[PDB]
Design a binder for this molecule. Sequence first.
Ligand SMILES: NC(=O)c1cnc(N[C@H]2CCCNC2)c2cc(-c3ccc(Cl)cc3)sc12
Length: 257
Amino acid sequence: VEDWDLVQTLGEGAGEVQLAVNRVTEEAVAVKIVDMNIKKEICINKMLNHENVVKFYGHRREGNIQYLFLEYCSGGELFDRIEPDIGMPEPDAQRFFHQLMAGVVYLHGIGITHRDIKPENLLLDERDNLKISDFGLATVFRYNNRERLLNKMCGTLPYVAPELLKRREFHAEPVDVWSCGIVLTAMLAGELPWDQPSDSCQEYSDWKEKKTYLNPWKKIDSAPLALLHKILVENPSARITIPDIKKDRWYNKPLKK
Ligand SMILES: NC(=O)c1cnc(N[C@H]2CCCNC2)c2cc(-c3ccc(Cl)cc3)sc12
Protein backbone atom coordinates (compact mmCIF):
# COMPACT_ATOMS: atom_id res chain seq x y z
CA VAL A 1 0.00 0.00 0.00
CA GLU A 2 2.90 2.34 0.78
CA ASP A 3 5.28 0.75 -1.75
CA TRP A 4 5.35 2.41 -5.17
CA ASP A 5 7.06 1.61 -8.46
CA LEU A 6 8.16 4.31 -10.91
CA VAL A 7 7.02 2.78 -14.19
CA GLN A 8 7.24 5.51 -16.84
CA THR A 9 8.36 9.06 -17.58
CA LEU A 10 5.29 11.24 -18.14
CA GLY A 11 6.71 14.71 -18.76
CA GLU A 12 9.35 17.30 -17.92
CA GLY A 13 9.12 20.68 -16.23
CA ALA A 14 12.83 21.41 -16.64
CA GLY A 15 12.32 18.73 -14.31
CA GLU A 16 10.53 15.39 -14.72
CA VAL A 17 7.14 13.81 -14.06
CA GLN A 18 6.99 10.05 -13.54
CA LEU A 19 4.11 7.62 -13.18
CA ALA A 20 4.06 5.70 -9.90
CA VAL A 21 2.03 2.53 -9.42
CA ASN A 22 1.23 1.01 -6.04
CA ARG A 23 2.52 -2.59 -5.98
CA VAL A 24 -0.48 -3.68 -3.87
CA THR A 25 -3.46 -1.58 -5.00
CA GLU A 26 -2.25 -0.78 -8.51
CA GLU A 27 -3.39 2.77 -7.82
CA ALA A 28 -1.50 5.34 -9.86
CA VAL A 29 -0.10 8.73 -8.96
CA ALA A 30 2.00 11.24 -10.84
CA VAL A 31 5.33 12.15 -9.22
CA LYS A 32 6.84 15.54 -9.99
CA ILE A 33 10.59 15.49 -9.35
CA VAL A 34 12.39 18.79 -8.83
CA ASP A 35 16.13 19.32 -8.60
CA MET A 36 16.58 21.79 -5.73
CA ASN A 37 9.75 28.48 -5.15
CA ILE A 38 8.87 24.82 -4.71
CA LYS A 39 7.96 25.46 -1.07
CA LYS A 40 5.33 27.94 -2.24
CA GLU A 41 3.99 25.54 -4.86
CA ILE A 42 3.51 22.98 -2.09
CA CYS A 43 1.78 25.44 0.21
CA ILE A 44 -0.66 26.48 -2.51
CA ASN A 45 -1.23 22.87 -3.59
CA LYS A 46 -2.32 21.99 -0.04
CA MET A 47 -5.20 24.49 -0.37
CA LEU A 48 -6.62 22.91 -3.52
CA ASN A 49 -9.71 20.71 -3.50
CA HIS A 50 -11.77 20.79 -6.72
CA GLU A 51 -12.80 18.38 -9.46
CA ASN A 52 -11.11 20.53 -12.12
CA VAL A 53 -7.79 21.04 -10.28
CA VAL A 54 -5.06 18.35 -10.05
CA LYS A 55 -5.32 16.95 -6.49
CA PHE A 56 -2.22 17.13 -4.27
CA TYR A 57 -1.47 14.02 -2.22
CA GLY A 58 1.84 14.89 -0.51
CA HIS A 59 5.55 15.68 -0.81
CA ARG A 60 8.91 14.11 -0.02
CA ARG A 61 12.39 15.62 -0.04
CA GLU A 62 15.12 12.98 -0.30
CA GLY A 63 18.03 15.43 -0.22
CA ASN A 64 18.36 18.14 -2.86
CA ILE A 65 15.51 16.44 -4.74
CA GLN A 66 11.90 17.26 -3.90
CA TYR A 67 9.03 14.91 -4.74
CA LEU A 68 5.44 15.98 -5.31
CA PHE A 69 2.71 13.33 -5.37
CA LEU A 70 -0.20 14.37 -7.57
CA GLU A 71 -3.44 13.09 -9.05
CA TYR A 72 -2.54 11.14 -12.22
CA CYS A 73 -4.19 12.46 -15.38
CA SER A 74 -3.99 9.63 -17.89
CA GLY A 75 -5.41 11.73 -20.74
CA GLY A 76 -2.26 13.87 -20.79
CA GLU A 77 -2.07 17.52 -21.90
CA LEU A 78 -4.89 19.44 -23.47
CA PHE A 79 -2.14 20.74 -25.80
CA ASP A 80 -2.03 17.31 -27.45
CA ARG A 81 -5.77 17.36 -28.24
CA ILE A 82 -5.26 20.47 -30.36
CA GLU A 83 -4.64 19.71 -34.05
CA PRO A 84 -2.28 22.27 -35.58
CA ASP A 85 -4.17 24.69 -37.87
CA ILE A 86 -7.47 22.96 -37.12
CA GLY A 87 -8.16 23.00 -33.38
CA MET A 88 -10.81 20.47 -32.27
CA PRO A 89 -14.57 19.99 -32.66
CA GLU A 90 -16.46 22.96 -31.24
CA PRO A 91 -18.55 20.87 -28.81
CA ASP A 92 -15.30 19.43 -27.35
CA ALA A 93 -13.80 22.94 -27.03
CA GLN A 94 -16.94 24.19 -25.29
CA ARG A 95 -16.93 21.32 -22.77
CA PHE A 96 -13.26 21.85 -21.97
CA PHE A 97 -13.94 25.62 -21.68
CA HIS A 98 -16.84 25.05 -19.24
CA GLN A 99 -14.51 22.85 -17.15
CA LEU A 100 -11.68 25.39 -17.29
CA MET A 101 -14.07 28.14 -16.05
CA ALA A 102 -15.24 25.90 -13.21
CA GLY A 103 -11.61 25.37 -12.10
CA VAL A 104 -10.74 29.07 -12.50
CA VAL A 105 -13.83 30.23 -10.59
CA TYR A 106 -12.78 27.87 -7.82
CA LEU A 107 -9.23 29.18 -7.60
CA HIS A 108 -10.27 32.80 -7.69
CA GLY A 109 -12.90 31.97 -5.03
CA ILE A 110 -10.10 30.88 -2.65
CA GLY A 111 -7.94 33.90 -3.52
CA ILE A 112 -5.50 32.04 -5.77
CA THR A 113 -4.35 33.06 -9.23
CA HIS A 114 -2.65 30.47 -11.45
CA ARG A 115 -0.67 32.95 -13.62
CA ASP A 116 0.29 30.42 -16.30
CA ILE A 117 -2.86 29.06 -17.89
CA LYS A 118 -2.13 27.31 -21.19
CA PRO A 119 -2.87 23.93 -22.80
CA GLU A 120 0.38 22.42 -21.51
CA ASN A 121 -0.87 23.09 -17.94
CA LEU A 122 -4.40 21.75 -18.41
CA LEU A 123 -4.51 17.97 -18.11
CA LEU A 124 -7.17 15.37 -18.86
CA ASP A 125 -8.15 12.40 -16.73
CA GLU A 126 -9.35 9.00 -17.96
CA ARG A 127 -12.82 10.46 -18.64
CA ASP A 128 -11.46 13.51 -20.47
CA ASN A 129 -12.23 15.81 -17.53
CA LEU A 130 -10.02 18.89 -17.49
CA LYS A 131 -7.72 19.47 -14.53
CA ILE A 132 -5.71 22.69 -13.95
CA SER A 133 -2.07 21.77 -13.26
CA ASP A 134 1.38 23.21 -12.56
CA PHE A 135 1.02 25.76 -9.73
CA GLY A 136 4.70 26.78 -9.71
CA LEU A 137 3.76 30.39 -10.69
CA ALA A 138 0.51 30.63 -8.66
CA THR A 139 0.18 33.20 -5.92
CA VAL A 140 -2.33 34.66 -3.45
CA PHE A 141 -4.22 37.69 -4.73
CA ARG A 142 -6.85 37.91 -1.97
CA TYR A 143 -6.43 37.32 1.71
CA ASN A 144 -8.75 38.19 4.58
CA ASN A 145 -11.10 39.56 1.90
CA ARG A 146 -8.55 42.15 0.84
CA GLU A 147 -7.24 42.13 -2.72
CA ARG A 148 -3.54 42.45 -3.46
CA LEU A 149 -2.45 43.87 -6.86
CA LEU A 150 0.22 41.91 -8.72
CA ASN A 151 3.42 43.41 -10.11
CA LYS A 152 5.57 40.41 -11.03
CA MET A 153 5.81 39.76 -14.76
CA CYS A 154 5.38 36.02 -15.25
CA GLY A 155 3.59 33.49 -17.39
CA THR A 156 4.07 32.56 -21.08
CA LEU A 157 4.17 35.35 -23.66
CA PRO A 158 1.51 34.22 -26.17
CA TYR A 159 -0.86 33.77 -23.23
CA VAL A 160 -0.11 36.87 -21.12
CA ALA A 161 -2.47 39.82 -20.93
CA PRO A 162 -1.33 43.17 -22.34
CA GLU A 163 -1.49 44.99 -19.00
CA LEU A 164 1.24 42.73 -17.64
CA LEU A 165 3.60 44.15 -20.23
CA LYS A 166 2.50 47.76 -19.84
CA ARG A 167 1.57 48.38 -16.21
CA ARG A 168 3.52 48.45 -12.95
CA GLU A 169 0.59 46.83 -11.10
CA PHE A 170 -2.49 45.00 -12.24
CA HIS A 171 -5.44 42.96 -10.99
CA ALA A 172 -4.95 39.14 -10.95
CA GLU A 173 -8.34 37.96 -12.19
CA PRO A 174 -8.48 39.64 -15.61
CA VAL A 175 -5.01 38.21 -16.40
CA ASP A 176 -6.27 34.63 -15.88
CA VAL A 177 -9.45 35.45 -17.88
CA TRP A 178 -7.29 36.60 -20.79
CA SER A 179 -5.17 33.44 -20.85
CA CYS A 180 -8.37 31.36 -20.86
CA GLY A 181 -9.43 33.34 -24.00
CA ILE A 182 -6.09 32.52 -25.67
CA VAL A 183 -6.64 28.83 -24.75
CA LEU A 184 -10.14 28.99 -26.30
CA THR A 185 -8.67 30.57 -29.44
CA ALA A 186 -6.10 27.74 -29.70
CA MET A 187 -8.78 25.07 -29.22
CA LEU A 188 -10.99 26.50 -31.97
CA ALA A 189 -8.28 27.41 -34.52
CA GLY A 190 -5.28 25.21 -33.76
CA GLU A 191 -3.04 28.28 -33.65
CA LEU A 192 -2.07 31.12 -31.30
CA PRO A 193 -3.13 34.61 -32.41
CA TRP A 194 0.12 36.43 -31.59
CA ASP A 195 3.61 36.15 -30.20
CA GLN A 196 2.61 38.64 -27.46
CA PRO A 197 -0.02 41.35 -27.02
CA SER A 198 2.42 44.24 -27.49
CA ASP A 199 1.93 47.47 -29.42
CA SER A 200 4.76 46.29 -31.70
CA CYS A 201 3.13 42.93 -32.60
CA GLN A 202 1.40 43.18 -35.96
CA GLU A 203 -0.99 40.34 -35.24
CA TYR A 204 -2.16 42.05 -32.06
CA SER A 205 -2.67 45.36 -33.85
CA ASP A 206 -4.71 43.53 -36.48
CA TRP A 207 -7.02 42.14 -33.77
CA LYS A 208 -7.34 45.57 -32.16
CA GLU A 209 -8.36 46.88 -35.58
CA LYS A 210 -11.02 44.15 -35.88
CA LYS A 211 -9.52 42.44 -38.93
CA THR A 212 -11.29 39.18 -38.15
CA TYR A 213 -11.13 38.11 -41.80
CA LEU A 214 -7.57 37.03 -41.01
CA ASN A 215 -6.54 33.81 -39.27
CA PRO A 216 -7.03 32.60 -36.71
CA TRP A 217 -10.32 34.50 -36.38
CA LYS A 218 -11.57 33.48 -39.81
CA LYS A 219 -11.67 29.83 -38.65
CA ILE A 220 -13.87 30.56 -35.65
CA ASP A 221 -17.68 30.61 -35.77
CA SER A 222 -19.36 33.95 -35.11
CA ALA A 223 -20.80 32.77 -31.77
CA PRO A 224 -17.55 31.81 -29.94
CA LEU A 225 -15.84 34.65 -31.82
CA ALA A 226 -18.27 37.06 -30.13
CA LEU A 227 -17.16 35.69 -26.75
CA LEU A 228 -13.49 36.13 -27.71
CA HIS A 229 -14.27 39.76 -28.64
CA LYS A 230 -15.37 40.25 -24.95
CA ILE A 231 -12.44 38.36 -23.41
CA LEU A 232 -9.49 39.69 -25.46
CA VAL A 233 -10.19 43.33 -24.55
CA GLU A 234 -7.04 45.40 -23.98
CA ASN A 235 -8.32 47.39 -20.98
CA PRO A 236 -8.56 44.87 -18.12
CA SER A 237 -11.17 47.02 -16.37
CA ALA A 238 -13.46 46.70 -19.43
CA ARG A 239 -12.69 43.02 -19.99
CA ILE A 240 -15.50 40.52 -19.40
CA THR A 241 -15.57 38.88 -15.94
CA ILE A 242 -16.31 35.20 -15.32
CA PRO A 243 -19.85 35.81 -14.05
CA ASP A 244 -20.59 37.47 -17.41
CA ILE A 245 -18.78 34.77 -19.41
CA LYS A 246 -21.24 32.32 -17.82
CA LYS A 247 -24.02 34.43 -19.38
CA ASP A 248 -22.54 34.46 -22.87
CA ARG A 249 -24.64 33.17 -25.76
CA TRP A 250 -22.02 30.70 -27.04
CA TYR A 251 -21.13 29.57 -23.52
CA ASN A 252 -24.79 28.53 -23.14
CA LYS A 253 -25.36 27.15 -26.65
CA PRO A 254 -26.31 23.46 -26.71
CA LEU A 255 -23.73 21.66 -28.87
CA LYS A 256 -23.33 18.05 -29.99
CA LYS A 257 -20.99 16.24 -32.34
N1 LIG B 1 -0.44 15.25 -12.68
C1 LIG B 1 -0.15 14.51 -13.82
O1 LIG B 1 -0.65 13.38 -14.02
C2 LIG B 1 0.77 15.11 -14.78
C3 LIG B 1 1.48 16.22 -14.49
N2 LIG B 1 2.33 16.78 -15.32
C4 LIG B 1 2.50 16.32 -16.59
N3 LIG B 1 3.35 16.98 -17.44
C5 LIG B 1 3.63 18.41 -17.23
C6 LIG B 1 4.89 18.75 -18.06
C7 LIG B 1 5.21 20.26 -18.01
C8 LIG B 1 3.98 21.03 -18.51
N4 LIG B 1 2.81 20.73 -17.67
C9 LIG B 1 2.43 19.28 -17.72
C10 LIG B 1 1.83 15.11 -16.98
C11 LIG B 1 1.85 14.38 -18.22
C12 LIG B 1 1.00 13.28 -18.20
C13 LIG B 1 0.79 12.29 -19.28
C14 LIG B 1 1.64 12.28 -20.39
C15 LIG B 1 1.46 11.35 -21.41
C16 LIG B 1 0.41 10.45 -21.32
CL1 LIG B 1 0.18 9.28 -22.58
C17 LIG B 1 -0.45 10.44 -20.22
C18 LIG B 1 -0.26 11.36 -19.21
S1 LIG B 1 0.22 13.13 -16.71
C19 LIG B 1 0.96 14.53 -16.06
